[PDB]
RNA sequence: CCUGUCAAACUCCAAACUUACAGACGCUGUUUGACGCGGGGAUUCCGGUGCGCGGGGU
RNA sequence: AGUGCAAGAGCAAAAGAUGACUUGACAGUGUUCUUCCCAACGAGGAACGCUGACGCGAAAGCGUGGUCUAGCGAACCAAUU
RNA sequence: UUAGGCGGCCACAGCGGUGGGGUUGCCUCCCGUACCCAUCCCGAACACGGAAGAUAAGCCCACCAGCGUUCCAGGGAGUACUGGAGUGCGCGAGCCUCUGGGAAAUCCGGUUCGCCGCCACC
């Protein structure tokens, strides 16, 4: 399970690439989705590789992100342990977080929005013109490297 | 005409003589120089002139560089000296010129050029150990008459 | 082994390449059967502009009709070594050509499942000379 | 053979066994082929339909399995040819085959030949095959009367092995009678 | 194009690779397809008759009946539906 | 035999890629009716630039 | 190689050659594609059927002209069946 | 299939080569023209009739790789080329990094001297 974050806008970007982002339920910049690691989903992230930031998050970081940014399918309601308990098949945020990572369920399946609408990176990111290997913030990241981004976007 | 008009590889490969008529003859007199009866492996030293940029060299530039290179070897090693130089590239690319404004712009045939890629050998001379510094000077004169910058690389010689 | 390997006469082709007919009568008298006309292809400048026109005649002789001809045909010419084919046939001359081959040539002349005769079963120039020499004449 | 550009014919053409142009025209009907083949000593007649991995033979008949019914005479002639065709046609009726098209292969369409006799036999057995009555031999040559009139020019016997002296074309009639009977073990 | 003929720009698709030269095998020219079956459209360069317009090479149509010996195959060219008359010689079964 | 070069109108080879159909995932539609069909009204048929691939031309 | 003529393409027990027989270069009416990719548009064209009548062949079958892609023309008026 | 018939794929099956195999059996070559049929001339072929002889052809069986072909290993090569991205480099033609694909020639070493279907048959 990878976590996609759009870091580059829609303007001047190819339609077939923009449409893939909308299929992956990510419509705005700084929006995040939890995509499983299958062959079909792999082709989709490879196509968006240059306008996105992805990688597998740590159980600890995914938990923090879900607490602060996860929303219901409809509504303002905070997704805390008590919310999870009353609507989901789990007990707390940790139970959900484990299942998402082990690819047992999805956010939509549990009545949560497929999108985690994050805040802009605190202290800024490494740049949108270069990939990770070149010192930028695009493409595949380390499990520690994606966490720095997702935690900075609390 | 200047080489600026024909040096770059921008037009398609136009070599098909069955569709092209009135092509001027090659100004290149010889391709095999020196002692063409003796073999290349009979010489201890093999030095080549390597073209650094991907270019298109005209038959006149090919003749001028070959003539100013072999003439130095005829001067320093004698007319029947112990060397053999080879020009491995041949002028295949047929060149045009629009010589009426831009209407019916397809030009008439004016010459021929050789497509040489970067890193390739234009000239290759095979000599002995004592005549090694004379050939490096023949290439110094030969590179001044073509379009790109060049390398004088020794491919068979640990005698330094 | 030797019985199915010993050569025989397949066909004796007697042809007269004239160029423009009257010579059909002399063949039917010397051979014993009916002759056939010979046509030509490609326009030649020696006043030979017509394609489908009789230029000569030929007769192909089989079995008895072939041997009863060669008894009187062979003494009429001096046979040489350079007068032989690589396949073991010979022509002398009025042209007289004798096609010699081994007992299983039908395999290459039939319709159903025909195959070409292997190099080993094909007649040699030397193996041909010996067969004719063994029948009333000299070689060299 | 010579290089990469070289074109080697199809296997059955290389072998000179199948005429692929005549095969296409034959298969265009949709009916099974009455494969009429002949050897020097024997005569074969197959009823072939088309299949996914190759040809399917639904009912065959060789002139060798003709002796099983009462044939003491040779197997590569006109009476044998008809009877092999009749035997093939009868085995075809018990398989469910009603109609067929004559395949002669690389044999010639010569008027009154053994392959046309194979066809006459199969039609007589109850099979619907497109034919031409005046291209088939007259009823007496099919009987083997031409062989009896050759044995009249005796002096020296025609047959080596003892079957008879002056030949019996009545054996054809004795066998056609045995095959027309429904009791027979096919 | 320089001319708008049916065989324009068809040097490659209507030519056989040297080893696929000569007369084609009959098995595929007699092949029986049923209605509803998905078929691939590819012209056999060795077979002259029963061809379709070379623009439709590579189409995977659906057999919707027949006209004589030839088949009526339904395709969708761009967004427009067309019915193609084609013989078995130029058709291959999908899968 | 050896040795030196080429091809828009060459090819024993041969991608990336584009493309038909089908399944799957995704997304979308069944009160926001998609897909499709029928009808009313247009405007429009001087375009331009970047990038990639071009063809002509110094 | 040849296959009437550009070019590209097809063809070898043939689509080429020979020979012989023959007039399907036939009448009528369609389906479809093309003309006009997608996507509307005439004439023209082609593939593929049916009805009628024929030719050849043992027969399956082939012949809606020439192996395929050029060789074409509205309304009005006249002539013709 | 102790030799056959009809095929599918249509060279992995081609080209070339070595060895083996046939009393009432099979396939052939073979013997032979009264007839059906036949040759613009030839029972050569086609067609028909038949077994005195034969395993030399063909064919069937086993096998050889020199040529041609198929595929595989390794090397060439993640090279050549390339879909997506870049306030990366170069006066420029052009190049480079990241991401996703990925050859061809040739050399060396294996493979390949057909596979499969239906039918009939000591
Ligand atoms: Cl046969
Ligand atoms: Cl069409
Ligand atoms: Mg909401
Ligand atoms: Mg700040
Ligand atoms: Mg920045
Ligand atoms: Mg092309
Ligand atoms: Mg008028
Ligand atoms: Mg008039
Ligand atoms: Mg033997
Ligand atoms: Mg710059
Ligand atoms: Na002017
Ligand atoms: Na073919
Ligand atoms: Na029309
Ligand atoms: Na004549
Ligand atoms: Na043998
Ligand atoms: Sr240019
Ligand atoms: Sr220079
Ligand atoms: Sr394209
Ligand atoms: Sr035609
Ligand atoms: Sr004979
Ligand atoms: Sr400059
Ligand atoms: Sr790979």
UniProtKB/Swiss-Prot annotation, chain A:
* Basic and acidic residues bias spans: 123-144
- Entry GO CC: cytosolic large ribosomal subunit
* Start and end residues of each stretch annotated as Disordered: 114-146
Keyword annotations from UniProtKB, A to Z: Ribonucleoprotein, Ribosomal protein, RNA-binding, rRNA-binding
Classify the source by domain of life: Archaea
List this protein's GO terms for biological process: maturation of LSU-rRNA from tricistronic rRNA transcript (SSU-rRNA, 5.8S rRNA, LSU-rRNA); translation
**Which Gene Ontology molecular-function terms are recorded?**
rRNA binding; structural constituent of ribosome
Assembly, in brief, is: Part of the 50S ribosomal subunit. Binds 5S rRNA.
Similarity comment text for this entry: Belongs to the universal ribosomal protein uL30 family.
This one is known as Large ribosomal subunit protein uL30
Upper classification of the source organism reads: Archaea, Methanobacteriati, Methanobacteriota, Stenosarchaea group, Halobacteria
Curated annotation (Swiss-Prot), chain B:
Transmembrane portions of the chain: none
Keywords for this entry? Ribonucleoprotein, Ribosomal protein, RNA-binding, rRNA-binding, tRNA-binding
Record keywords: Ribonucleoprotein included?
A: yes
UniProt xrefs under Pfam families: Ribosomal_L16 (PF00252)
For the biological process aspect of GO, one term held by this record is: translation
Q: Which domain of life is it from?
A: Archaea
Gene Ontology cellular component annotations, sorted alphabetically? ribonucleoprotein complex; ribosome
Question: In the record, what terms sit under GO molecular function?
Answer: rRNA binding; structural constituent of ribosome; tRNA binding
Record carries keyword Ribonucleoprotein = yes
Report the CDD domains cross-referenced here. Ribosomal_L16_L10e (cd01433)
Give the similarity note: Belongs to the universal ribosomal protein uL16 family.
Q: What does this protein do?
A: This is 1 of 5 proteins that mediate the attachment of the 5S rRNA onto the large ribosomal subunit, stabilizing the orientation of adjacent RNA domains. Modeling places the A and P site tRNAs in close proximity to this protein.
* NCBIfam families the record matches: PRK04199.1-4, PRK04199.1-6
| Quaternary organization | Part of the 50S ribosomal subunit. Weakly binds 5S rRNA. Probably binds the A and P site tRNAs.
Q: What is the name of this protein? A: Large ribosomal subunit protein uL16
**Organism, scientific name:** Haloarcula marismortui (strain ATCC 43049 / DSM 3752 / JCM 8966 / VKM B-1809) (Halobacterium marismortui)
UniProtKB/Swiss-Prot annotation, chain D:
Q: Specify the superkingdom.
A: Archaea
Q: Which GO terms describe its cellular component?
A: cytosolic large ribosomal subunit
Which Gene3D superfamilies does the entry mention? Answer: 3.30.420.100
UniProt cross-references to Pfam families, sorted A to Z: Ribosomal_L5e (PF17144)
Family annotation (InterPro entries): Rbsml_uL18_euk
Q: Does the keyword Ribonucleoprotein apply?
A: yes
- Disulfide linkages recorded for this protein, renumbered to the chain, are none
Q: Which GO terms describe its biological process?
A: ribosomal large subunit assembly; translation
The question of whether Nucleus is a record keyword is answered with no
The UniProt transmembrane annotation reads none
Q: Which SUPFAM superfamilies match?
A: Translational machinery components
Arranged from A to Z, the UniProt key words for this protein are: Ribonucleoprotein, Ribosomal protein, RNA-binding, rRNA-binding
Annotated GO molecular function terms are: 5S rRNA binding; structural constituent of ribosome
Record CDD domains? Ribosomal_L18_L5e
Question: Subunit comment for this entry?
Answer: Part of the 50S ribosomal subunit. Interacts with proteins L5 and L21e, and attaches the 5S rRNA to the 23S rRNA. Has been cross-linked to L21e.
Family the UniProt entry places it in: Belongs to the universal ribosomal protein uL18 family.
Give the protein's biological function.
Answer: This is one of 5 proteins that mediate the attachment of the 5S rRNA onto the large ribosomal subunit, where it forms part of the central protuberance and stabilizes the orientation of adjacent RNA domains.
Q: What is this protein called?
A: Large ribosomal subunit protein uL18
Native organism: Haloarcula marismortui (strain ATCC 43049 / DSM 3752 / JCM 8966 / VKM B-1809) (Halobacterium marismortui)
UniProtKB/Swiss-Prot annotation, chain E:
From which domain of life does this come?
A: Archaea
Keywords of this protein's UniProt record, alphabetized?
A: Ribonucleoprotein, Ribosomal protein, RNA-binding, rRNA-binding
Report residue spans for region: Disordered: 1-65
List the GO terms this entry assigns under cellular component, sorted alphabetically.
ribonucleoprotein complex; ribosome
Keyword match Heme: no
Entry's Gene Ontology BP terms? translation
Pfam families in alphabetical order: Ribosomal_L21e
- Recall the GO molecular function terms of this protein's record: rRNA binding; structural constituent of ribosome
> Family per UniProt?
Belongs to the eukaryotic ribosomal protein eL21 family.
- Function in brief: This is one of 5 proteins that mediate the attachment of the 5S rRNA onto the large ribosomal subunit, stabilizing the orientation of adjacent RNA domains.
Assembly and interaction partners: Part of the 50S ribosomal subunit. Interacts with protein L18 and binds the 5S rRNA. Has been cross-linked to L18.
What is the protein's name according to its record? Large ribosomal subunit protein eL21
Q: Which species is the source of this protein?
A: Haloarcula marismortui (strain ATCC 43049 / DSM 3752 / JCM 8966 / VKM B-1809)
What's the source species' lineage?
Answer: Archaea, Methanobacteriati, Methanobacteriota, Stenosarchaea group, Halobacteria
């Amino acid at each position: 399970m990878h976590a996609l974050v759009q870091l580059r806008g829609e303007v001047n970007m190819h339609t077939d690439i923009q449409d893939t982002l909308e299929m992956l339920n990510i419509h705005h910049v700084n929006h995040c989705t939890l995509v499983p690691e299958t062959d079909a989903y792999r082709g989709m992230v490879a196509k968006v590789n240059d306008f996105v930031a992805f990688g597998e998050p740590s159980q600890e970081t995914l938990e923090t992100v879900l607490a602060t940014r996860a929303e219901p399918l409809e509504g303002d309601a905070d997704v805390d342990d008590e919310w999870v308990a009353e609507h989901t098949d789990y007990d707390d945020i940790s139970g959900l977080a484990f299942a998402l990572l082990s690819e047992e369920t999805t956010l939509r399946e549990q009545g949560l929005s497929p999108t985690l609408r994050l805040h802009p990176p605190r202290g800024g990111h490494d740049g949108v013109k270069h990939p990770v290997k070149e010192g930028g913030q695009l493409g595949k990241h380390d499990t520690e490297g994606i966490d720095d981004l997702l935690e900075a976007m609390r | 005409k200047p080489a600026s008009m024909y040096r770059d590889i921008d037009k398609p490969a136009y070599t098909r003589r069955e569709y092209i008529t009135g092509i001027p003859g090659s100004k290149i007199a010889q391709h095999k120089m020196g002692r063409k009866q003796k073999d290349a492996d009979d010489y201890p030293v093999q030095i080549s002139l390597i073209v650094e940029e991907t270019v298109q060299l005209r038959h006149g530039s090919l003749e001028a560089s070959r003539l100013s290179a072999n003439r130095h070897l005829i001067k320093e090693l004698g007319e029947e000296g112990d060397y053999k130089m080879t020009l491995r590239k041949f002028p295949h690319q047929v060149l045009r010129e629009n010589k009426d404004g831009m209407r019916a712009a397809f030009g008439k045939i004016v010459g021929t050029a050789a497509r040489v890629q970067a890193g390739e050998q234009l000239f290759t001379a095979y000599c002995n150990v004592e005549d090694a510094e004379h050939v490096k000077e023949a290439f110094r004169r030969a590179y001044n008459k073509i379009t790109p910058s060049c390398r004088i690389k020794v491919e068979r010689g640990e005698e330094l | 082994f030797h019985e199915m390997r010993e050569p025989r006469i397949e066909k004796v082709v007697v042809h007269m390449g004239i160029g423009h007919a009257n010579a059909e009568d002399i063949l039917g008298e010397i051979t014993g059967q009916m002759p056939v006309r010979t046509k030509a292809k490609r326009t030649v400048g020696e006043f030979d502009i017509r394609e489908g026109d009789p230029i000569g005649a030929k007769v192909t002789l089989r079995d008895e009709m072939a041997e009863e001809f060669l008894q009187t045909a062979l003494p009429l010419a001096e046979l040489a070594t350079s007068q032989f084919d690589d396949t073991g046939n010979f022509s002398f001359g009025l042209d007289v050509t004798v096609n010699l081959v081994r007992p299983g040539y039908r395999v290459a002349k039939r319709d159903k499942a025909s195959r070409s005769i292997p190099t080993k079963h094909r007649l040699n120039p030397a193996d041909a000379v010996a067969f004719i020499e063994s029948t009333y004449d000299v070689e060299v | 053979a010579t290089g990469p550009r070289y074109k080697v014919p199809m296997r059955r053409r290389r072998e000179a066994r199948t005429d692929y142009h005549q095969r296409l025209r034959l298969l265009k009907s949709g009916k099974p082929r009455l494969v009429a083949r002949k050897s020097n000593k024997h005569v074969r007649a197959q009823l072939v339909t088309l299949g996914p991995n190759g040809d399917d033979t639904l009912a065959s008949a060789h002139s060798s399995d003709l002796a099983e019914y009462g044939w003491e005479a040779p197997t590569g002639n006109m009476p044998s040819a008809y009877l092999t065709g009749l035997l093939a046609g009868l085995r075809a009726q018990e398989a469910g085959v009603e109609e067929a098209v004559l395949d002669i292969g690389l044999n010639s369409p010569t008027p009154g030949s053994k392959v046309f006799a194979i066809q006459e036999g199969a039609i007589d057995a109850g099979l619907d095959i497109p034919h031409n009555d005046d291209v088939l031999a007259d009823w007496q040559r099919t009987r083997g009367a031409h062989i009896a009139e050759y044995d009249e020019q005796l002096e020296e016997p025609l047959y080596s092995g003892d079957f008879d002296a002056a030949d019996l074309p009545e054996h054809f009639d004795e066998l056609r009678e045995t095959l027309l009977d429904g009791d027979i073990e096919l | 194009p320089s001319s708008n003929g049916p065989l324009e720009g068809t040097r490659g698709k209507l030519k056989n690779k040297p080893r696929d030269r000569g007369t084609s095998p009959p098995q595929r020219a007699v092949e029986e397809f049923d209605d509803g079956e998905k078929v691939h459209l590819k012209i056999d360069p060795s077979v002259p008759n029963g061809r379709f317009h070379p623009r439709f090479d590579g189409q995977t149509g659906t057999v919707e009946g027949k006209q004589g010996d030839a088949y009526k195959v339904d395709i969708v060219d761009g967004g427009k539906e067309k019915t193609i008359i084609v013989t078995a010689a130029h058709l291959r079964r999908q899968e």
